[PDB]
Amino acid sequence: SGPVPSRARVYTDVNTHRPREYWDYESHVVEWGNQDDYQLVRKLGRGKYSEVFEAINITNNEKVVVKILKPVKKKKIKREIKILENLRGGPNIITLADIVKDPVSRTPALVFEHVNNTDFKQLYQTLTDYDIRFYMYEILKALDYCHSMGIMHRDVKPHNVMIDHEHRKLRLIDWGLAEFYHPGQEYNVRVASRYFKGPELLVDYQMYDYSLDMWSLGCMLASMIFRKEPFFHGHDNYDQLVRIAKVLGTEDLYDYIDKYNIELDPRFNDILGRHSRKRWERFVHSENQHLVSPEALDFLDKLLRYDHQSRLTAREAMEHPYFYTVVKDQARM
Numbered sequence: 001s002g003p004v005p006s007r008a009r010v011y012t013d014v015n016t017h018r019p020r021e022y023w024d025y026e027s028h029v030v031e032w033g034n035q036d037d038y039q040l041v042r043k044l045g046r047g048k049y050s051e052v053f054e055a056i057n058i059t060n061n062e063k064v065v066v067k068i069l070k071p072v073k074k075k076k077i078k079r080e081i082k083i084l085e086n087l088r089g090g091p092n093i094i095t096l097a098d099i100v101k102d103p104v105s106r107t108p109a110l111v112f113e114h115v116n117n118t119d120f121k122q123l124y125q126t127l128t129d130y131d132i133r134f135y136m137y138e139i140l141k142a143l144d145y146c147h148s149m150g151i152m153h154r155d156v157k158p159h160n161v162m163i164d165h166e167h168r169k170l171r172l173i174d175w176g177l178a179e180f181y182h183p184g185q186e187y188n189v190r191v192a193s194r195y196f197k198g199p200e201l202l203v204d205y206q207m208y209d210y211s212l213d214m215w216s217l218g219c220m221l222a223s224m225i226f227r228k229e230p231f232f233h234g235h236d237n238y239d240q241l242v243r244i245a246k247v248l249g250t251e252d253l254y255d256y257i258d259k260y261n262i263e264l265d266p267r268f269n270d271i272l273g274r275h276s277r278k279r280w281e282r283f284v285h286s287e288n289q290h291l292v293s294p295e296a297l298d299f300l301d302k303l304l305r306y307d308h309q310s311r312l313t314a315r316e317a318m319e320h321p322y323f324y325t326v327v328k329d330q331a332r333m
């Protein structure tokens with residue numbers, strides 16, 4: 001028999017109850033703007049599918065960020081545009097301002113409202129205990145929002161979190177790998193960066209959901225509270241699961257494989273071995289102990305589960321005791 005089917009525990013049917021047009025991004029008609037409204041100021045960085053620039057809107061002298069959509073299928077372009085339009089105005093989600101094409105090269109570009117080019121990876125190994133809780137809560141607002149809107153990000157990692165630490169403001173960026181969640185859909189498992197890939201991607205379980213983002217978030221949290229970058233440091237996608245298995249243990253891994261009737265790639269048979277589930281205390285030392293609390297470990301434990309169904313949802317995560325002081329201070333402000 002094949003793999004056992006899976007459904008998201010939350011927001012399962014939200015796209016089914018929308019109009020077709022909400023999620024049928026292949027049918028979306030983009031009104032392409034004029035590239036000449038903007039002047040590029042400077043390169044901010046060059047990614048995999050994108051070059052990103054600081055630019056000026058020469059109509060209002062407003063600073064913007066421009067992402068030139070490096071050669072890729074039109075299908076992927078429409079998907080990213082439609083997701084950005086659907087999520088526009090959501091909490092801590094980057095704001096799409098315009099969509100333009102080069103009159104010559106015909107190359108699409110996305111224009112975003114300005115954010116400083118300071119990503120979370122530059123700051124997240126130097127935060128106080130309170131600021132880790134604060135910024136994790138801000139990321140959870142973006143994830144509960146996009147999940148509630150029927151969208152999984154699929155590339156949650158520190159390089160995709162822009163922070164203005166001065167203004168205590170955060171935006172979740174790079175929606176290029178994001179997808180709409182549809183119950184029973186089998187997704188590409190070649191998404192996310194190696195260190196943030198959930199076990200579902202590593203064992204090739206395709207019927208995954210929003211809970212993939214919650215694994216990635218757990219990898220970020222573990223990195224920050226233990227000052228260990230990355231937390232799960234695999235050589236390649238096979239060794240990545242071994243690094244996880246040495247922490248979470250093999251018993252829960254094989255129970256997860258049995259539960260979903262997953263056919264494990266033969267390469268895994270000699271490399272996973274047999275490992276106890278490690279107590280989180282093993283990762284605590286004199287230079288991280290100020291970031292580690294019972295509350296932090298209880299929360300982390302509930303994100304980092306093999307079984308995607310077991311993991312906290314974004315809204316359940318926001319209700320965890322780890323965030324009580326953040327929630328109280330927000331209500332006061």
Ligand SMILES: Brc1ccc2nn[nH]c2c1
Nearest residue numbers: 035038039040066100109
């Ligand atoms: Br938006 C934008 C503005 C000017 C540009 N020059 N090359 N590519 C561009 C994209």
Ligand SMILES: Brc1ccc2nn[nH]c2c1
Nearest residue numbers: 052065094112173174175
């Ligand atoms: Br603003 C901004 C900066 C970089 C980005 N990469 N993808 N989306 C982005 C938005």
Ligand SMILES: [Cl-]
Nearest residue numbers: 121157158159
């Ligand atoms: Cl990163």
Ligand SMILES: [Cl-]
Nearest residue numbers: 231232233243
């Ligand atoms: Cl490791």
Ligand SMILES: [Cl-]
Nearest residue numbers: 276277278279
């Ligand atoms: Cl132990």
Ligand code: NA
Nearest residue numbers: 289290292293
């Ligand atoms: Na401590």
